[PDB]
Write an enzyme that holds these catalytic residues in place. Sequence first.
Site, short mmCIF file in Angstrom:
data_model
loop_
_atom_site.label_atom_id
_atom_site.label_comp_id
_atom_site.label_asym_id
_atom_site.label_seq_id
_atom_site.Cartn_x
_atom_site.Cartn_y
_atom_site.Cartn_z
N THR B 30 -43.33 28.34 53.30
CA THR B 30 -43.62 29.74 53.04
C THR B 30 -42.45 30.62 53.49
O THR B 30 -41.53 30.17 54.18
CB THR B 30 -44.91 30.17 53.75
OG1 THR B 30 -44.79 29.93 55.16
CG2 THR B 30 -46.09 29.38 53.21
N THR B 31 -42.50 31.89 53.10
CA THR B 31 -41.39 32.81 53.31
C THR B 31 -41.51 33.46 54.69
O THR B 31 -42.54 34.06 55.02
CB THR B 31 -41.37 33.88 52.22
OG1 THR B 31 -41.30 33.25 50.94
CG2 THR B 31 -40.17 34.79 52.40
#
Lengths: 232, 240
Positions: B30-31
Amino acid sequence: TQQPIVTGTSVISMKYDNGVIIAADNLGSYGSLLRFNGVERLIPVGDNTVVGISGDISDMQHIERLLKDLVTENAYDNPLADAEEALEPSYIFEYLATVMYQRRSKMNPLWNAIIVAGVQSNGDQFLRYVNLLGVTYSSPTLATGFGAHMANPLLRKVVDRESDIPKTTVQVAEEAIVNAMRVLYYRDARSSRNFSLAIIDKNTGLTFKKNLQVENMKWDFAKDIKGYGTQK
Amino acid sequence: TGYDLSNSVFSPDGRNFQVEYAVKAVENGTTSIGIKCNDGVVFAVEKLITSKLLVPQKNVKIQVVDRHIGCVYSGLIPDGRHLVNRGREEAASFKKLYKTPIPIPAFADRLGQYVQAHTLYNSVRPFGVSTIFGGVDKNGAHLYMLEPSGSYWGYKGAATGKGRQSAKAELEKLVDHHPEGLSAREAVKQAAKIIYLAHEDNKEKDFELEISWCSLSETNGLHKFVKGDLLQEAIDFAQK
Protein backbone atom coordinates in the site's frame (compact mmCIF):
# COMPACT_ATOMS: atom_id res chain seq x y z
CA THR A 1 26.74 -1.88 45.34
CA GLN A 2 28.82 -3.15 48.26
CA GLN A 3 28.79 0.10 50.28
CA PRO A 4 26.83 3.35 49.82
CA ILE A 5 28.73 6.59 49.27
CA VAL A 6 26.26 9.44 48.69
CA THR A 7 23.03 8.76 50.56
CA GLY A 8 19.61 10.31 51.04
CA THR A 9 17.58 10.21 54.25
CA SER A 10 14.12 8.86 55.07
CA VAL A 11 10.97 9.05 52.95
CA ILE A 12 7.62 9.21 54.74
CA SER A 13 4.11 8.51 53.47
CA MET A 14 0.54 7.88 54.59
CA LYS A 15 -2.86 7.04 53.13
CA TYR A 16 -5.99 9.10 53.71
CA ASP A 17 -9.65 8.72 52.72
CA ASN A 18 -9.22 9.79 49.08
CA GLY A 19 -5.53 9.33 48.25
CA VAL A 20 -1.91 9.10 49.43
CA ILE A 21 0.75 11.61 50.50
CA ILE A 22 4.53 11.11 50.31
CA ALA A 23 7.46 13.35 51.21
CA ALA A 24 11.26 13.41 51.35
CA ASP A 25 14.07 15.91 51.87
CA ASN A 26 16.45 17.27 49.23
CA LEU A 27 19.86 16.41 50.71
CA GLY A 28 22.57 14.05 49.50
CA SER A 29 25.05 13.41 52.31
CA TYR A 30 28.65 12.18 51.98
CA GLY A 31 29.76 10.46 55.19
CA SER A 32 28.72 13.09 57.79
CA LEU A 33 29.32 15.85 55.20
CA LEU A 34 26.17 17.63 53.98
CA ARG A 35 27.56 17.75 50.48
CA PHE A 36 24.76 18.09 47.91
CA ASN A 37 21.65 20.26 48.30
CA GLY A 38 18.84 20.09 45.77
CA VAL A 39 18.50 16.35 45.13
CA GLU A 40 14.95 15.39 44.18
CA ARG A 41 14.18 11.96 45.64
CA LEU A 42 10.50 11.74 44.62
CA ILE A 43 9.99 10.56 41.03
CA PRO A 44 6.48 10.83 39.50
CA VAL A 45 5.81 7.97 37.07
CA GLY A 46 2.82 9.12 35.03
CA ASP A 47 -0.09 10.81 36.79
CA ASN A 48 -1.06 8.13 39.35
CA THR A 49 2.26 7.06 40.92
CA VAL A 50 5.15 8.53 42.91
CA VAL A 51 8.27 6.56 43.85
CA GLY A 52 10.28 7.75 46.86
CA ILE A 53 13.82 6.43 47.20
CA SER A 54 16.32 6.52 50.06
CA GLY A 55 19.91 5.28 50.13
CA ASP A 56 22.64 5.44 47.51
CA ILE A 57 22.11 8.32 45.09
CA SER A 58 23.83 6.65 42.12
CA ASP A 59 21.56 3.61 42.43
CA MET A 60 18.62 6.02 42.72
CA GLN A 61 19.57 7.61 39.39
CA HIS A 62 19.86 4.12 37.88
CA ILE A 63 16.34 3.36 39.14
CA GLU A 64 15.04 6.62 37.64
CA ARG A 65 16.50 5.59 34.28
CA LEU A 66 14.82 2.19 34.60
CA LEU A 67 11.45 3.81 35.32
CA LYS A 68 11.71 6.12 32.31
CA ASP A 69 12.63 3.13 30.13
CA LEU A 70 9.62 1.23 31.48
CA VAL A 71 7.28 4.11 30.58
CA THR A 72 8.74 4.33 27.07
CA GLU A 73 8.42 0.57 26.53
CA ASN A 74 4.81 0.65 27.75
CA ALA A 75 4.00 3.37 25.21
CA TYR A 76 5.15 1.19 22.28
CA ASP A 77 2.39 -0.21 20.03
CA ASN A 78 -0.26 0.79 22.58
CA PRO A 79 -2.97 3.21 21.38
CA LEU A 80 -4.46 3.09 24.91
CA ALA A 81 -1.26 4.25 26.64
CA ASP A 82 -3.15 7.26 28.06
CA ALA A 83 -6.14 5.04 28.88
CA GLU A 84 -7.03 1.72 30.53
CA GLU A 85 -3.66 0.38 29.32
CA ALA A 86 -1.61 2.95 31.24
CA LEU A 87 0.87 1.82 33.87
CA GLU A 88 -0.42 1.33 37.42
CA PRO A 89 1.31 1.56 40.82
CA SER A 90 0.92 -2.20 41.28
CA TYR A 91 2.77 -2.90 38.02
CA ILE A 92 5.59 -0.50 38.92
CA PHE A 93 6.00 -1.95 42.40
CA GLU A 94 6.01 -5.53 41.13
CA TYR A 95 8.71 -4.65 38.59
CA LEU A 96 10.85 -2.81 41.15
CA ALA A 97 10.52 -5.62 43.70
CA THR A 98 11.51 -8.19 41.07
CA VAL A 99 14.60 -6.13 40.22
CA MET A 100 15.59 -5.67 43.87
CA TYR A 101 15.23 -9.36 44.76
CA GLN A 102 17.04 -10.54 41.62
CA ARG A 103 19.95 -8.19 42.31
CA ARG A 104 20.08 -9.34 45.93
CA SER A 105 20.26 -12.95 44.72
CA LYS A 106 23.38 -12.02 42.70
CA MET A 107 25.17 -10.39 45.68
CA ASN A 108 25.05 -7.07 43.76
CA PRO A 109 22.22 -5.16 45.44
CA LEU A 110 20.82 -1.71 44.80
CA TRP A 111 21.46 -0.13 48.21
CA ASN A 112 18.05 1.52 48.47
CA ALA A 113 14.73 1.54 50.28
CA ILE A 114 11.73 2.42 48.12
CA ILE A 115 8.13 3.44 48.81
CA VAL A 116 5.68 3.31 45.90
CA ALA A 117 2.53 5.40 46.42
CA GLY A 118 -0.42 6.02 44.15
CA VAL A 119 -4.05 5.42 43.22
CA GLN A 120 -5.26 2.44 41.21
CA SER A 121 -7.69 2.69 38.29
CA ASN A 122 -10.61 1.51 40.44
CA GLY A 123 -9.75 4.28 42.92
CA ASP A 124 -8.15 2.18 45.66
CA GLN A 125 -5.07 3.65 47.31
CA PHE A 126 -1.70 1.91 46.91
CA LEU A 127 1.24 2.21 49.30
CA ARG A 128 4.01 -0.38 49.52
CA TYR A 129 7.65 -0.70 50.60
CA VAL A 130 10.60 -2.69 49.24
CA ASN A 131 14.26 -2.52 50.32
CA LEU A 132 17.67 -3.69 49.10
CA LEU A 133 16.98 -7.24 50.34
CA GLY A 134 13.70 -7.45 48.41
CA VAL A 135 11.58 -7.43 51.58
CA THR A 136 8.16 -5.96 50.79
CA TYR A 137 5.31 -4.85 53.02
CA SER A 138 2.28 -2.56 53.13
CA SER A 139 0.73 -0.49 55.92
CA PRO A 140 -1.55 2.56 56.28
CA THR A 141 1.64 4.54 57.05
CA LEU A 142 5.12 3.86 55.68
CA ALA A 143 8.60 5.17 56.42
CA THR A 144 12.15 3.89 55.96
CA GLY A 145 15.32 4.25 57.97
CA PHE A 146 15.37 7.01 60.56
CA GLY A 147 11.80 8.12 59.83
CA ALA A 148 10.62 4.59 60.58
CA HIS A 149 11.60 5.27 64.21
CA MET A 150 10.08 8.74 64.56
CA ALA A 151 7.62 9.43 61.73
CA ASN A 152 5.66 6.19 62.11
CA PRO A 153 4.69 6.80 65.79
CA LEU A 154 3.30 10.24 64.94
CA LEU A 155 1.51 9.19 61.74
CA ARG A 156 -0.02 6.14 63.43
CA LYS A 157 -1.61 8.63 65.84
CA VAL A 158 -3.72 9.88 62.93
CA VAL A 159 -4.27 6.58 61.09
CA ASP A 160 -3.90 3.71 63.57
CA ARG A 161 -6.09 1.15 61.77
CA GLU A 162 -7.52 0.51 58.33
CA SER A 163 -10.84 1.75 59.74
CA ASP A 164 -9.32 5.20 60.37
CA ILE A 165 -8.55 5.76 56.67
CA PRO A 166 -12.07 6.93 55.64
CA LYS A 167 -12.10 9.38 58.58
CA THR A 168 -8.85 11.11 57.57
CA THR A 169 -9.14 14.18 55.35
CA VAL A 170 -6.33 15.46 53.13
CA GLN A 171 -5.75 18.52 55.35
CA VAL A 172 -5.18 16.44 58.50
CA ALA A 173 -2.88 14.02 56.66
CA GLU A 174 -0.79 16.82 55.14
CA GLU A 175 -0.48 18.58 58.51
CA ALA A 176 0.69 15.31 60.08
CA ILE A 177 3.24 14.76 57.28
CA VAL A 178 4.62 18.30 57.65
CA ASN A 179 4.89 17.91 61.43
CA ALA A 180 6.74 14.61 61.00
CA MET A 181 9.17 16.32 58.62
CA ARG A 182 9.79 19.05 61.20
CA VAL A 183 10.45 16.44 63.90
CA LEU A 184 12.92 14.64 61.62
CA TYR A 185 14.73 17.92 60.97
CA TYR A 186 14.87 18.43 64.74
CA ARG A 187 16.39 15.05 65.54
CA ASP A 188 18.05 13.63 62.38
CA ALA A 189 21.63 14.82 61.87
CA ARG A 190 21.67 13.83 58.17
CA SER A 191 18.51 15.81 57.32
CA SER A 192 17.78 19.09 55.56
CA ARG A 193 15.32 21.92 56.09
CA ASN A 194 14.19 21.74 52.44
CA PHE A 195 11.92 18.92 51.27
CA SER A 196 9.37 17.97 48.62
CA LEU A 197 5.86 16.56 48.97
CA ALA A 198 3.41 14.81 46.65
CA ILE A 199 -0.34 14.24 46.94
CA ILE A 200 -2.06 11.65 44.74
CA ASP A 201 -5.85 11.95 44.86
CA LYS A 202 -8.53 9.91 43.11
CA ASN A 203 -10.68 12.94 42.22
CA THR A 204 -8.06 15.64 41.63
CA GLY A 205 -4.75 15.09 39.89
CA LEU A 206 -1.21 14.65 41.12
CA THR A 207 0.00 17.65 43.12
CA PHE A 208 3.80 17.91 43.37
CA LYS A 209 5.05 20.63 45.72
CA LYS A 210 8.76 21.50 45.76
CA ASN A 211 10.92 23.90 47.77
CA LEU A 212 8.97 23.30 50.98
CA GLN A 213 10.84 24.50 54.07
CA VAL A 214 10.35 23.48 57.69
CA GLU A 215 8.39 26.33 59.24
CA ASN A 216 8.51 28.13 62.62
CA MET A 217 10.56 26.13 65.13
CA LYS A 218 10.91 26.21 68.92
CA TRP A 219 14.39 27.45 69.82
CA ASP A 220 13.79 30.24 72.39
CA PHE A 221 13.99 27.98 75.45
CA ALA A 222 17.64 27.30 74.56
CA LYS A 223 18.46 30.67 76.12
CA ASP A 224 17.40 29.26 79.50
CA ILE A 225 19.81 26.31 79.34
CA LYS A 226 23.00 27.07 81.27
CA GLY A 227 26.06 24.85 81.58
CA TYR A 228 25.73 21.19 82.46
CA GLY A 229 24.92 20.21 86.02
CA THR A 230 25.89 22.98 88.43
CA GLN A 231 27.11 25.96 86.37
CA LYS A 232 25.49 29.31 87.17
CA THR B 1 20.57 -16.19 -15.38
CA GLY B 2 22.03 -18.18 -12.50
CA TYR B 3 23.03 -15.03 -10.60
CA ASP B 4 19.50 -14.47 -9.21
CA LEU B 5 19.29 -17.60 -7.02
CA SER B 6 21.41 -16.37 -4.09
CA ASN B 7 21.81 -13.15 -2.15
CA SER B 8 25.14 -11.27 -2.22
CA VAL B 9 26.09 -12.66 -5.65
CA PHE B 10 27.25 -10.07 -8.18
CA SER B 11 25.92 -10.41 -11.71
CA PRO B 12 28.28 -9.82 -14.67
CA ASP B 13 26.84 -6.29 -14.99
CA GLY B 14 27.32 -5.58 -11.28
CA ARG B 15 23.80 -6.22 -10.00
CA ASN B 16 22.22 -8.06 -7.06
CA PHE B 17 18.95 -9.54 -8.32
CA GLN B 18 17.60 -10.57 -4.90
CA VAL B 19 17.50 -6.91 -3.83
CA GLU B 20 15.62 -6.03 -7.03
CA TYR B 21 13.13 -8.81 -6.31
CA ALA B 22 12.72 -7.36 -2.81
CA VAL B 23 11.95 -4.02 -4.49
CA LYS B 24 9.32 -5.86 -6.54
CA ALA B 25 7.82 -7.12 -3.28
CA VAL B 26 7.83 -3.55 -1.94
CA GLU B 27 5.99 -2.32 -5.05
CA ASN B 28 3.04 -4.63 -4.22
CA GLY B 29 2.27 -2.90 -0.91
CA THR B 30 0.00 0.00 0.00
CA THR B 31 0.93 3.66 -0.41
CA SER B 32 2.85 5.37 2.42
CA ILE B 33 3.78 9.05 2.29
CA GLY B 34 5.81 11.51 4.33
CA ILE B 35 5.79 15.30 4.15
CA LYS B 36 8.29 17.69 5.75
CA CYS B 37 6.75 20.94 7.00
CA ASN B 38 8.28 24.12 8.42
CA ASP B 39 8.81 22.66 11.90
CA GLY B 40 7.96 18.96 11.72
CA VAL B 41 7.00 15.88 9.74
CA VAL B 42 3.68 14.27 8.78
CA PHE B 43 3.24 10.57 7.93
CA ALA B 44 0.17 9.20 6.15
CA VAL B 45 -0.80 5.67 5.15
CA GLU B 46 -3.68 3.81 3.49
CA LYS B 47 -5.06 0.59 4.99
CA LEU B 48 -7.14 -1.67 2.76
CA ILE B 49 -10.43 -2.91 4.23
CA THR B 50 -10.36 -6.42 2.77
CA SER B 51 -13.41 -7.49 4.80
CA LYS B 52 -16.06 -5.56 6.71
CA LEU B 53 -15.31 -7.81 9.72
CA LEU B 54 -12.13 -5.82 10.44
CA VAL B 55 -12.53 -3.71 13.59
CA PRO B 56 -12.33 -0.03 12.56
CA GLN B 57 -9.52 2.15 13.96
CA LYS B 58 -7.62 -0.98 15.06
CA ASN B 59 -4.70 -2.69 13.28
CA VAL B 60 -2.44 0.35 13.61
CA LYS B 61 0.29 0.65 10.97
CA ILE B 62 2.29 3.78 11.85
CA GLN B 63 4.80 3.06 14.61
CA VAL B 64 6.76 5.18 17.08
CA VAL B 65 10.44 4.97 18.03
CA ASP B 66 11.55 6.54 21.34
CA ARG B 67 9.19 9.52 21.87
CA HIS B 68 10.13 11.61 18.83
CA ILE B 69 10.57 9.28 15.81
CA GLY B 70 7.74 8.24 13.50
CA CYS B 71 8.01 5.32 11.07
CA VAL B 72 5.79 3.89 8.33
CA TYR B 73 6.60 1.30 5.69
CA SER B 74 5.32 -0.39 2.55
CA GLY B 75 5.88 -4.04 1.63
CA LEU B 76 5.88 -7.09 3.92
CA ILE B 77 4.51 -5.69 7.21
CA PRO B 78 6.29 -8.25 9.47
CA ASP B 79 9.64 -7.15 8.00
CA GLY B 80 8.75 -3.54 8.82
CA ARG B 81 7.92 -4.53 12.39
CA HIS B 82 11.27 -6.35 12.66
CA LEU B 83 13.07 -3.24 11.43
CA VAL B 84 11.15 -1.01 13.86
CA ASN B 85 12.05 -3.30 16.78
CA ARG B 86 15.71 -3.08 15.76
CA GLY B 87 15.44 0.71 15.58
CA ARG B 88 13.90 0.83 19.05
CA GLU B 89 16.80 -1.24 20.40
CA GLU B 90 19.30 1.10 18.70
CA ALA B 91 17.59 4.20 20.09
CA ALA B 92 17.54 2.71 23.59
CA SER B 93 21.26 1.90 23.41
CA PHE B 94 22.09 5.40 22.19
CA LYS B 95 20.02 7.00 24.95
CA LYS B 96 21.63 4.80 27.60
CA LEU B 97 25.15 5.60 26.39
CA TYR B 98 24.87 9.34 25.74
CA LYS B 99 21.90 10.55 27.85
CA THR B 100 20.23 12.29 24.91
CA PRO B 101 17.54 11.23 22.41
CA ILE B 102 19.19 9.87 19.27
CA PRO B 103 19.46 12.41 16.42
CA ILE B 104 17.45 11.50 13.34
CA PRO B 105 20.43 11.20 10.92
CA ALA B 106 22.19 8.89 13.39
CA PHE B 107 19.07 6.72 13.61
CA ALA B 108 18.86 6.68 9.81
CA ASP B 109 22.48 5.53 9.59
CA ARG B 110 21.91 2.76 12.14
CA LEU B 111 18.86 1.51 10.23
CA GLY B 112 20.78 1.73 6.95
CA GLN B 113 23.69 -0.29 8.33
CA TYR B 114 21.29 -2.95 9.61
CA VAL B 115 19.47 -3.18 6.26
CA GLN B 116 22.74 -3.23 4.30
CA ALA B 117 24.11 -6.02 6.49
CA HIS B 118 21.38 -8.27 5.06
CA THR B 119 22.75 -7.94 1.51
CA LEU B 120 26.23 -9.23 2.47
CA TYR B 121 25.49 -12.96 2.88
CA ASN B 122 23.57 -15.70 1.09
CA SER B 123 22.33 -17.18 4.39
CA VAL B 124 19.91 -14.26 4.90
CA ARG B 125 17.14 -12.58 2.89
CA PRO B 126 16.94 -8.84 2.13
CA PHE B 127 14.20 -6.83 3.80
CA GLY B 128 11.12 -6.47 1.61
CA VAL B 129 10.01 -3.07 2.92
CA SER B 130 10.62 0.55 1.99
CA THR B 131 10.49 2.75 5.09
CA ILE B 132 9.61 6.44 5.43
CA PHE B 133 10.60 7.76 8.85
CA GLY B 134 11.59 10.96 10.57
CA GLY B 135 11.03 13.33 13.43
CA VAL B 136 12.42 16.36 15.26
CA ASP B 137 15.74 16.83 17.07
CA LYS B 138 17.86 19.76 18.26
CA ASN B 139 18.76 20.58 14.64
CA GLY B 140 15.13 20.65 13.49
CA ALA B 141 12.87 18.39 11.43
CA HIS B 142 14.22 15.47 9.40
CA LEU B 143 12.52 13.13 6.92
CA TYR B 144 14.23 10.07 5.43
CA MET B 145 13.39 7.17 3.13
CA LEU B 146 15.19 3.82 3.20
CA GLU B 147 15.16 1.18 0.42
CA PRO B 148 15.74 -2.60 0.57
CA SER B 149 19.31 -2.14 -0.70
CA GLY B 150 20.12 -0.21 2.48
CA SER B 151 20.42 3.12 0.67
CA TYR B 152 18.59 6.01 2.28
CA TRP B 153 18.19 9.71 1.58
CA GLY B 154 16.64 12.81 3.10
CA TYR B 155 13.59 14.15 1.31
CA LYS B 156 11.31 17.16 1.13
CA GLY B 157 8.53 14.65 0.44
CA ALA B 158 8.61 10.88 0.02
CA ALA B 159 6.18 8.26 -1.26
CA THR B 160 6.29 4.48 -1.61
CA GLY B 161 4.00 1.60 -2.50
CA LYS B 162 1.70 0.75 -5.38
CA GLY B 163 0.42 4.30 -5.87
CA ARG B 164 3.85 5.90 -5.60
CA GLN B 165 3.86 7.62 -9.01
CA SER B 166 0.75 9.76 -8.50
CA ALA B 167 1.77 10.48 -4.91
CA LYS B 168 5.20 11.65 -6.12
CA ALA B 169 3.60 13.88 -8.75
CA GLU B 170 1.30 15.42 -6.12
CA LEU B 171 4.22 15.91 -3.72
CA GLU B 172 6.29 17.59 -6.45
CA LYS B 173 3.43 19.96 -7.27
CA LEU B 174 2.98 20.69 -3.56
CA VAL B 175 6.69 21.48 -3.14
CA ASP B 176 6.74 23.64 -6.28
CA HIS B 177 3.69 25.67 -5.25
CA HIS B 178 4.93 26.34 -1.68
CA PRO B 179 8.57 27.50 -1.82
CA GLU B 180 8.34 29.04 1.66
CA GLY B 181 7.00 25.81 3.17
CA LEU B 182 3.91 24.44 4.87
CA SER B 183 2.46 24.39 8.36
CA ALA B 184 1.78 21.15 10.23
CA ARG B 185 -2.02 21.24 9.90
CA GLU B 186 -1.84 22.19 6.23
CA ALA B 187 0.58 19.29 5.78
CA VAL B 188 -1.94 16.95 7.44
CA LYS B 189 -4.67 18.12 5.06
CA GLN B 190 -2.37 17.73 2.04
CA ALA B 191 -1.34 14.24 3.17
CA ALA B 192 -5.01 13.25 3.41
CA LYS B 193 -5.64 14.65 -0.08
CA ILE B 194 -2.61 12.89 -1.58
CA ILE B 195 -3.48 9.53 -0.02
CA TYR B 196 -7.05 9.82 -1.33
CA LEU B 197 -5.80 10.72 -4.82
CA ALA B 198 -3.27 7.87 -4.84
CA HIS B 199 -5.95 5.38 -3.79
CA GLU B 200 -7.77 6.10 -7.07
CA ASP B 201 -5.44 3.62 -8.77
CA ASN B 202 -6.93 0.81 -6.62
CA LYS B 203 -10.70 1.30 -6.62
CA GLU B 204 -11.46 -2.40 -6.03
CA LYS B 205 -11.40 -2.10 -2.22
CA ASP B 206 -12.25 0.55 0.35
CA PHE B 207 -9.50 2.10 2.45
CA GLU B 208 -8.98 3.81 5.79
CA LEU B 209 -6.63 6.77 6.21
CA GLU B 210 -4.12 6.94 9.07
CA ILE B 211 -2.16 10.12 9.83
CA SER B 212 0.52 10.96 12.40
CA TRP B 213 2.69 14.02 12.94
CA CYS B 214 5.64 15.32 14.94
CA SER B 215 6.09 19.09 15.19
CA LEU B 216 7.67 21.57 17.58
CA SER B 217 4.71 23.98 17.76
CA GLU B 218 1.90 21.37 17.67
CA THR B 219 3.18 18.40 19.72
CA ASN B 220 6.19 19.99 21.48
CA GLY B 221 8.56 17.83 19.46
CA LEU B 222 6.82 14.51 20.11
CA HIS B 223 5.14 12.06 17.74
CA LYS B 224 1.34 11.86 17.97
CA PHE B 225 -1.44 10.29 15.95
CA VAL B 226 -4.21 12.41 14.43
CA LYS B 227 -7.54 11.16 15.80
CA GLY B 228 -9.87 14.01 16.80
CA ASP B 229 -11.60 16.77 14.87
CA LEU B 230 -8.43 17.38 12.84
CA LEU B 231 -8.64 13.91 11.29
CA GLN B 232 -12.26 14.49 10.26
CA GLU B 233 -11.38 17.90 8.83
CA ALA B 234 -8.55 16.35 6.81
CA ILE B 235 -10.85 13.60 5.52
CA ASP B 236 -13.48 16.17 4.52
CA PHE B 237 -10.83 18.26 2.75
CA ALA B 238 -9.54 15.19 0.89
CA GLN B 239 -13.02 14.07 -0.20
CA LYS B 240 -13.91 17.61 -1.32
